[PDB]
Design an enzyme around this catalytic site. Sequence first.
Site, short mmCIF file in Angstrom:
data_model
loop_
_atom_site.label_atom_id
_atom_site.label_comp_id
_atom_site.label_asym_id
_atom_site.label_seq_id
_atom_site.Cartn_x
_atom_site.Cartn_y
_atom_site.Cartn_z
CG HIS A 219 54.95 69.51 47.10
ND1 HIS A 219 54.08 69.32 46.04
CD2 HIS A 219 54.95 68.35 47.79
CE1 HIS A 219 53.58 68.10 46.10
NE2 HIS A 219 54.09 67.49 47.15
NE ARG B 37 55.56 59.83 48.02
CZ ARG B 37 56.63 60.59 47.83
NH1 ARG B 37 57.46 60.87 48.82
NH2 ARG B 37 56.87 61.09 46.62
CB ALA C 225 50.05 64.93 53.14
CB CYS D 247 46.73 68.60 54.97
SG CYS D 247 47.83 67.48 55.87
S1 ICS Z 1 55.83 64.27 44.58
FE1 ICS Z 1 53.61 64.43 44.37
S2 ICS Z 1 49.96 62.32 44.57
FE2 ICS Z 1 55.40 64.81 42.43
S3 ICS Z 1 52.41 64.72 46.20
FE3 ICS Z 1 51.98 62.73 45.42
S4 ICS Z 1 55.58 60.37 44.30
FE4 ICS Z 1 51.51 61.70 43.05
S5 ICS Z 1 51.42 62.52 40.94
MO1 ICS Z 1 50.89 60.30 45.30
S6 ICS Z 1 53.25 65.59 42.48
FE5 ICS Z 1 55.12 62.40 43.53
C1 ICS Z 1 53.17 62.55 43.78
FE6 ICS Z 1 53.22 63.37 41.98
S7 ICS Z 1 52.67 61.03 46.66
FE7 ICS Z 1 53.43 60.75 44.57
S8 ICS Z 1 52.01 59.54 43.38
S9 ICS Z 1 55.33 62.82 41.33
S1 CLF Z 2 45.13 68.68 58.17
FE1 CLF Z 2 47.08 67.49 57.95
S2 CLF Z 2 46.49 65.44 58.68
FE2 CLF Z 2 44.97 66.87 59.56
S3 CLF Z 2 45.65 67.31 61.89
FE3 CLF Z 2 46.23 68.91 60.20
S4 CLF Z 2 48.39 68.37 59.64
FE4 CLF Z 2 47.38 66.51 60.51
FE5 CLF Z 2 46.33 64.94 62.61
S5 CLF Z 2 46.04 64.26 64.95
FE6 CLF Z 2 44.24 63.58 63.70
S6 CLF Z 2 44.94 63.59 61.55
FE7 CLF Z 2 43.99 65.68 61.85
S7 CLF Z 2 42.70 65.28 63.68
FE8 CLF Z 2 44.72 66.28 64.05
#
Ligand code: ICS
Ligand code: CLF
Lengths: 522, 522, 477
Positions: C192, C93, C62, C59
């Site tokens: 992002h 992470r 995140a 989402c």
């Molecule tokens: S930020 Fe992106 S999914 Fe660019 S959300 Fe994700 S630490 Fe991946 S492919 Mo998890 S766009 Fe980084 C990524 Fe790549 S969390 Fe990390 S590995 S290089």
């Molecule tokens: S799409 Fe993303 S993770 Fe989902 S709520 Fe929305 S910002 Fe958060 Fe949050 S407390 Fe639990 S995990 Fe959801 S049902 Fe709500």
Amino acid sequence: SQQVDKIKASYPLFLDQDYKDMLAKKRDGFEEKYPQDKIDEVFQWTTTKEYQELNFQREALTVNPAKACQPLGAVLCALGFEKTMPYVHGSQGCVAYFRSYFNRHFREPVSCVSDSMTEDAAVFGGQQNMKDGLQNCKATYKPDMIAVSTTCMAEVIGDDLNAFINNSKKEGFIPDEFPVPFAHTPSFVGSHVTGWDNMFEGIARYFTLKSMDDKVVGSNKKINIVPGFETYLGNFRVIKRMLSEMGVGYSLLSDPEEVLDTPADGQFRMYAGGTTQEEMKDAPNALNTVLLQPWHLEKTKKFVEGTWKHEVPKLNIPMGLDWTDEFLMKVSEISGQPIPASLTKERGRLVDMMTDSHTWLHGKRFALWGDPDFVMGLVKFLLELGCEPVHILCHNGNKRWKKAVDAILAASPYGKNATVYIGKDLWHLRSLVFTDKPDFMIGNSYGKFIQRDTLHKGKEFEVPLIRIGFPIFDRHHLHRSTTLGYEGAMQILTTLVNSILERLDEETRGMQATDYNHDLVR
Amino acid sequence: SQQVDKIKASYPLFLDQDYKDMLAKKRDGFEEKYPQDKIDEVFQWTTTKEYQELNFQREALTVNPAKACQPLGAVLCALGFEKTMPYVHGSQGCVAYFRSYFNRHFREPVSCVSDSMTEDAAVFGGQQNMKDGLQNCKATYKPDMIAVSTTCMAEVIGDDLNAFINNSKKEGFIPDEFPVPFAHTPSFVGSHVTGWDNMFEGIARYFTLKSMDDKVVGSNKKINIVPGFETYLGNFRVIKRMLSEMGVGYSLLSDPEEVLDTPADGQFRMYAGGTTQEEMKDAPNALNTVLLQPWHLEKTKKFVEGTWKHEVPKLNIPMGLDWTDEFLMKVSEISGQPIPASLTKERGRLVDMMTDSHTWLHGKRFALWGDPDFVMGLVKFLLELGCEPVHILCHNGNKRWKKAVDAILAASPYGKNATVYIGKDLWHLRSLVFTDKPDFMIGNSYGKFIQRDTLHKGKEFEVPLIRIGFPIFDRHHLHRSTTLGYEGAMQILTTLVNSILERLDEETRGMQATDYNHDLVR
Amino acid sequence: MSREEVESLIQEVLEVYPEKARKDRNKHLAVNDPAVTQSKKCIISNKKSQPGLMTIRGCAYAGSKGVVWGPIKDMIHISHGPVGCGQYSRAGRRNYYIGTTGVNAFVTMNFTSDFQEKDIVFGGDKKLAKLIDEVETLFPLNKGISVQSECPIGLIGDDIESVSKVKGAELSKTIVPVRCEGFRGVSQSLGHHIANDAVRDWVLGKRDEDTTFASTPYDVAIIGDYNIGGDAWSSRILLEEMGLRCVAQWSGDGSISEIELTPKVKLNLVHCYRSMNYISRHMEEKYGIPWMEYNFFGPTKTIESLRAIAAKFDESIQKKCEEVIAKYKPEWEAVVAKYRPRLEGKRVMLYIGGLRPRHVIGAYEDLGMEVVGTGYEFAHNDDYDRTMKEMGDSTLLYDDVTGYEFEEFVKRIKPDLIGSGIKEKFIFQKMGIPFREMHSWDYSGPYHGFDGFAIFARDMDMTLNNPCWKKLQAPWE
Ligand code: ICS
Ligand code: CLF
Ligand SMILES: [Fe+3]
Ligand SMILES: [Fe+3]
């Protein structure tokens, strides 16, 4: 630099001189960090009692909570039924987080889906999303039943789950006879255990509220067991083994151990075991229904007593000597099956392990946190071991559970210096363990940071963490252990005594300084 | 000084200032101690390679042996039969030591008896001691049979057990029909495993040698299991559980299971469980006999292959995936019963745990020691886990076992850096872990001193001790664990991976120094 | 497989969906053709996920909190809303950092408002102000506060902009309000974008008038590296050994001061284009700072990136780059000599998020392995445009792949290794296929740089050639 014959991961590669010099250069040049003396002063202040008063005067900020939201428990409850797909009505990020959480705790595949509701779905509603998601899930993953939960986004806008599912059935997106139980799981009310309760209550209502005309209590000569939110497969296994040993017909509803312990033999099994639909349809015919974790199964208890006409016993969680015996005696009274010799021998062996380890377990001060029923069972077991609870924390507890735990503590002389906290978080617990230092902490993996802080204050202020609870991320295969019953009591006792002895061995390993107490025999 | 609120045991009471000053005065006044720099130099020298050369040049002095004497194993074997009192012919100090050893390891009462032989017996003999001891034991403790073993004193003066027992039966000291098996257990030959083998050989001979005229192989449609010297109760439990779950009739000879796990119910039970005399007499009628630890059951194998006419299979100890599989297939082939699906599921779960933990388990160097069969099974399991054993030690091992272990290590790429030692003690292992440092040590409670020495050298030289084997004195209830079969494999894997992760967490707990790798998820 | 067979497999896999789902998913599966420079003609990206198909996407919460703002260590990030999100995203992470957690660093901590029913019904502005006051009271050494909005906050119209402005003005603190509600967008990419907009509006231009910072002609900023086990540090040691001065790291181990000092650099070294391209373009347009993409995954990509970066400066920088390359050549040559024979000819299937599916192909090729199929969780058409060049003929490209689709694609391909997230690790481990977590590096790393290449090779060798994968079949079956 790396040597090929001895390759270094991040630790201890970043302890090298070049990396250290670059880190220091970056810090001094550009980080604009506060001076180290100020950092030490602030840490020491945070370890004090005035900071504890300031921390406990909090009213709106929660730091490091010890609870999750309802749909997580709803998914865990839905996973316990045969060929059942946990369906979450709302946003996909919630499902991704649930799956990551359960993957990290169980190291097992966890199947869960969502309708991927977007802004337009938040404004116009999620009727089309529900229809298409039900159709697609049934077509693709072919489950025997779809259990619907909710995210906070859908709950805020007031999605009518009943009307949505009825319209989905009416327009042919799903067969009319296909079972789609639903439950409202608002994330701003209660916690994950409340979600488990809500989902189980919804499923039970769906299969049994319209067919109570031909139901008689005691027809099938069985006992229904509702385990609640459980993350130890050993608990399910031990309950089933004990009831089989007593020769008691049982119908454990929402049993997920099979799908969370699938074998690795070359094929991926999405579904395995689980409570069958016939078992839940025949649930009202049981002699009685027993709730293993009553303090988060209140709605289920109300529904069972109101509809199934089952006189649910007032039983505590089968944790420890006294409560395991109470559970066994209640089961024997309900079913008429006497308690056999195997359980008596197991109880005797557990009492002999308590007698053996009482000299090391006595007087130990423990801080603990977790779920209400789990926390109260752990506190009871510690009271039967001669240990002294000092800080009891339950972020999702209420006043009634606190009163029950206070009565339990007052019933024993080892609860004199014990205080119960509800609604507090782990920052409060860190303040507590810094001001009133206990010997050990029993909790989930989130207490390792508290242990880190205590170690940073000093080796004599370190509070080691004993990992018993959910979720555990930094250790492997701890979800296979047992918490309930005599077997779980032996496991917990062994863990506690070995933790105490390991700490004692660590404290006495200094040569010519503290090794005079490095005894071979303990 | 003692404070009533906080009463201190020896540690940290002797770390107080007054006690420190008293000890310093004593040392500086009347001990004539060497200077501390000289002690540090001597320690550093003892940690060197030249000191390892001198240590391995030993042929007359043994420092910290890793084995016991034969009568201990004889007593353990005799305790495995129904209502059998282990009788020891010789000195009473030996019996006191055996009972203390097994009481400390098992935390359970141990029944053993002696004739209390004195210098008068050295002058004349132990005939009167034999008669009086047999009569007194039978009168007092009411045993169903008495198993006689000898100490080093009785074997040096060349006592004749058969003549002594026959004379005792002749002159009315014991009934002629009372079963009194005997075995010679010289303490200058072999170790406790040899004593176990000798005692089982004597008992089997006594019960079967003269009654092989009415015996037909396979009459009872059962398989005999000889477990050997075992100190893990879970091993007996898992063997029985697997054999019963396979649908195979089994006759588990020399089961000390029940007598070592007597429940606490307010009364003392001297005898419990054990193999019956009818089982021992009916043993030659079995289809075959399986030796769980063939490397210390050579005399038993010779007897059963020469007298019972059983084609004993060439099986390794059922430790780990491959050897558990081979044992199960051999049992299935002998009995004709197929392997149940539940055992396959258990194997798949073990494989799943292996796949989960291989990332942390890979590349780790282990130094291990213990009994031959247990050490070989541990080496095999480590080779299947991707770990490299480096220092394999077995004080009571021979050249044939060393050759077999060398073949096993050649069969795997992870055995390239391994070396097998026989006839070496724990001082040799200390030198080895100082010279070629392994990640961890696997063994009994006697490795804590080695860990202390390595810590004294430095924190980065510390080799943590993983407690698997016998005897375990500084931990509680580890004797209830399992090492055989899939369940024992999972327990060993969990212990290994959790020890590795605990070491990593300990090494990453320093704020702003190594806490960047203090990950919540591992 | 041949090109005619990949299409047949795609059709057979798609045959199970309903009409709408099949028609939608047919646009997200393609057979690679490196000649084509426009990915729009072959694949379609950045659309909503089909309901009920078990997507792996996340989402916007995140993509903002756990990706961009989270790695910042001196700030305090508030999960405004219900508890869940903060709890599920806490310390998941591995954005490594150096600091005293609880005093001056708060990366692994979870700060949340913990919304109740009364908060939904009556609002959260007063509660947010009280929370800010308590944050400042209990954590005095923080250098800023960020408010990450979870779904309900966006729904009920809570005005966090005014609260942030008032509390920042009265407390003289930088309080950044972020509207990262999960229901916005389709995936983490819009998170992002929202986080980058917040950085631009509330943080980046703070030092637009300060001229105390002395700037050297060798000033660079690492953009889009988040220090997953020390990758940012590994890249920074190579960059500093070249004579270049790194002022800012976005955002792994990053500090608010580095973000403020970024507009003074001479060149932006962007690692993750997908996450920080917007802020890179804004800096280029507003301050005139050029930006370039660099890849430090494997020796070949690292050497090419070092040469390209040195080409932007004078002769001394190029000489230092040559010196670093010559110094580090024997180590990675020895690593290749050790591990390529054990990994030659092996086939790899990848499914990662926005950047890594194409960035890690170079290392796999350096170790002698080939990538038979890659895929993106939320990448746009430009990322696929860059991806077609790096992938060989007749290789499968999938976007927003489902668990079903990935399962049968793997069943029909039988790859030697699969690199994806935690939500497919155990699914493919139980199938008997070695699996490597390509997000957290399986709690190992770093993998960037010459130092990371050895760890990468060791990890691939240990996962692929483990004895456990030959033991999944019982001898009696
Ligand atoms: S930020 Fe992106 S999914 Fe660019 S959300 Fe994700 S630490 Fe991946 S492919 Mo998890 S766009 Fe980084 C990524 Fe790549 S969390 Fe990390 S590995 S290089
Ligand atoms: S799409 Fe993303 S993770 Fe989902 S709520 Fe929305 S910002 Fe958060 Fe949050 S407390 Fe639990 S995990 Fe959801 S049902 Fe709500
Ligand atoms: Fe698993
Ligand atoms: Fe005992």
